[PDB]
Design a binder for these strands. Structure first.
Lengths: 100, 60, 59, 87
RNA sequence: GAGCUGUAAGUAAGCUUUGAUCCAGAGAUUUCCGAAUGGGGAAACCCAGCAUGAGUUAUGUCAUGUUAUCGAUAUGUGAAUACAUAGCAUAUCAGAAGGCACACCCGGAGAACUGAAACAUCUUAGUACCCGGAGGAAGAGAAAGAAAAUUCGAUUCCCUUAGUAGCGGCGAGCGAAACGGGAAGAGCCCAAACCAACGUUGGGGUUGUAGGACACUCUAGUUACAAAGGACGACAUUAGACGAAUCAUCUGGAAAGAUGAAUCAAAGAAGGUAAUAAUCCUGUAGUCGAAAAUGUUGUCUCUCUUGAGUGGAUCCUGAGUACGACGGAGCACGUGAAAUUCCGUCGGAAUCUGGGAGGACCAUCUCCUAAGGCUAAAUACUCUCUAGUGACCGAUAGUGAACCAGUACCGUGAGGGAAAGGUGAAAAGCACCCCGGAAGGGGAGUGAAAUAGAACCUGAAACCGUGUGCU
RNA sequence: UGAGUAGCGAAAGACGGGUGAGAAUCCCGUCCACCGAUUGACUAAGGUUUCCAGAGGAAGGCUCGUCCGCUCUGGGUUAGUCGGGUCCUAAGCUGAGGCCGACAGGCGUAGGCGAUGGAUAACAGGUUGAUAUUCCUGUACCACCUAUAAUCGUAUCG
């Protein structure tokens, strides 16, 4: 499960292979926003006076099932589990037993 | 999370007078004339009154 | 309606058949009579059948 | 008690005949004998007379959702001494 | 276990690792109308009596309690009839009422069109409608039975008997039962004779291979009927937690496809993810988990509680009942030779040498004991809850209703009743320029696609047009 | 399709000046014409915001429309005396206990409910874009409460 502040790698899409930080998460429809992928062109505020200056571009939300967590020791896209060694439920990698 | 009924029952009825009459009533006037910002202060006082009345009826 | 006080006498329903076996509904009432009988309180006039009146009864 | 609901500021009964009379809004189950005593308990004044009227619900949003506006009960008080029942 | 303040985006002001929003259990609050119940009434409103209390020098106005009717049991209970049964007076009791599944089940009452190629007996049919009382099931039920074998042993339900016996203007049509084969399967309490007490309490006592009272010696609770109150351990229901295994290269806006090598499986159900995924995400197989509440089931406790043979000199074993005539109804059976069960009217028995049944009736011979009352299981049904399935529908279909529908709308009313789904993977919903008062257009941009621009997937025919080759 | 066909629902209008993209139709002015026991002024029933102001011209208006009983956004009904209740009763409706009846229920006494009737205290002016016996001015009346006096007391209330 991807929270806000991780370092994921894109697996599918037009911007696959790149890596970025998850800054926002929309858990209702399961959408995440990664810094650097899915740039959109938006004609903002035709009537409203920003004052407008042209076209602005930000990041668009990407589906959570397309980004995967990384490993601290080998830097590869891996799944996650739960070892429960601590009183709080910790998250561990799949290629190794280290914490994510 | 914020509970305000740690006191006894003697000072309790004094809080329901101060929270409703001098506080909740004044915020509704400033909202009608168009003088009150921080409109989330109304919902806070509404719950402070209800929490006081719940513990009062619970003590029986 | 009218029902016996001592027992459960009441009217019934049958058919009125002519010579040609033509069916017509009808009633069969009981022979209810008004007599004043002893009660634990005041004696009261109640509907009693003539069958309960026979064999000896207080009035 | 909190009989008074809201004050009313309009073109009529406010900025015109408002220095001596005040227009309020109350609940729809109160008589002018309670409205008179409730004003004197909050503002420490003396009331001369109170006039109260009713209003029927009014339709709104002509179109898809055609509903009704809530009813209201308007009161108008007159003071003999004191002022500044609002700001 | 990190975001969140519904549909529903906006602009605002705020809450949350000091544990928000959310998902289950148990509590608090709960305006007015409605059986509506202080009186009234055009439901959601109006007007009051008593008890303290809040406010005022005082009346007015508020707050919280309480006041319907009928029934039942206590107490004042002193009438026309003197003494006393009626009327009245007030105080008590999770006493009654009114709703919903128009399904299922008992009972009261009870049609017609139709079939007979007309029609009245008959049939449709004890069906539809209406009314009353219930229950989770109801009703039935412990032989005055079925039979004819050297017998079986309460009731209900399913196959067969059988379209047979029989009934019928012997027309149309209606239509069994026993035997046998299965599902399920405990049977017990009262009246009386009698015995101590004051028509009454308790003991006693319950039947046909005849039982009890009386006489002689003497010796397991089945709280679902059987008499009925309580502390008493294991599962189960209502939130959840873990849970194996894939990388690369081409085409594309995008890989899950194709071509390569690999890996899991008590897991190759299913859905999603920019296209078709066992290994990307929710999951699946398989294990684990309950504060608190409710269930189902136990081991002890508690409450009940002496079992059988011999015995008729004398007693008991259900009365206006059984049964008969008369008029009807019900049994497959239409009054017929109609036995066997009910209702109304009027007559009216017998007392173990008794009484009833075996299809009129009599005789013999067999089986059984009516006229008091309870009883679980196999059976019928679904407004619902939960988990699943289909050679079922795919927007004129499927519920009238995929949609904010019993709603627009139509009738004084009871009542009747539609039409309307689809942009894209993602709003990334066309900044700016030009004509125009606007609307709507022409470019430029967004996108893989804008003849995908919210009257938004594909876009048929009728029909209305604009050009042209022959005539 | 019929077809650019029938119709466009009793009736007198003319001109000048304004507004505006656009006027026989909207605004203002003048002249002319119609009703006047009424095409005028108040009210009950019934309708239920159609009332007022500033904006709008897609649909509705049998043409047009800059206008509207249409659209959008804010506003507007003030009572001791006026009408109804805290007062009385007609017809009628309902009815404790009762009488009757297969059920459901029917009828009815005491007692209630029920105006179109009987009783009951306010009249002149001013004022707003929308209210007036209601608001504001001027002078009155009525039911009740308390505090002070004439005077008591066989008064006094039924």
């Amino acid at each position: 499960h991807i929270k806000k502040g991780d370092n994921v790698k894109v697996i599918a899409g037009k911007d696959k292979g790149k890596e970025g930080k998850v800054i926002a998460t929309l858990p209702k429809k399961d959408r995440v926003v990664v810094e650097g992928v899915n740039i959109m062109k938006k004609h903002q505020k035709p009537t409203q006076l920003n004052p407008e200056s042209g076209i602005l571009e930000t990041e668009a939300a990407i589906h959570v099932s397309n980004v995967q967590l990384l490993d601290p020791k080998t830097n590869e896209p891996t799944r996650v589990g739960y070892k429960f060694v601590d009183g709080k439920k910790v998250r561990i990698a799949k290629k190794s037993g280290e914490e994510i | 999370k914020a509970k305000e009924i740690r006191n006894l029952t003697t000072s309790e009825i004094e809080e329901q007078i101060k929270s409703s009459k001098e506080e909740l009533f004044n915020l509704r006037f400033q909202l009608a004339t168009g003088q009150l910002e921080e409109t989330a202060r109304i919902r806070t006082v509404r719950k402070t009154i209800a929490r006081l009345k719940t513990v009062a009826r619970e003590r029986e | 309606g009218k029902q016996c006080f001592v027992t459960g006498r009441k009217a019934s329903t049958g058919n009125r058949r002519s010579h040609a076996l033509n069916s017509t509904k009808r009633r069969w009432n009981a022979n209810l009579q008004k007599v004043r009988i002893l009660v634990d309180g005041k004696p009261k006039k109640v509907w009693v059948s003539a069958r309960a009146l026979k064999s000896g009864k207080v009035t | 008690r909190d009989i008074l609901k809201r004050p009313v500021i309009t073109e009529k009964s406010s900025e015109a005949m408002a220095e001596d009379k005040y227009t309020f809004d109350v609940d729809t189950r109160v008589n002018k004998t309670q409205v008179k005593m409730a004003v004197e308990e909050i503002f420490n004044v003396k009331v001369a007379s109170v006039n109260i009227m009713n209003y029927k619900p009014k339709k709104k949003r002509m179109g898809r959702y055609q509903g009704y506006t809530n009813k209201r009960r308007k009161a108008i008080v007159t003071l003999k001494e004191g002022s500044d029942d609002l700001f």
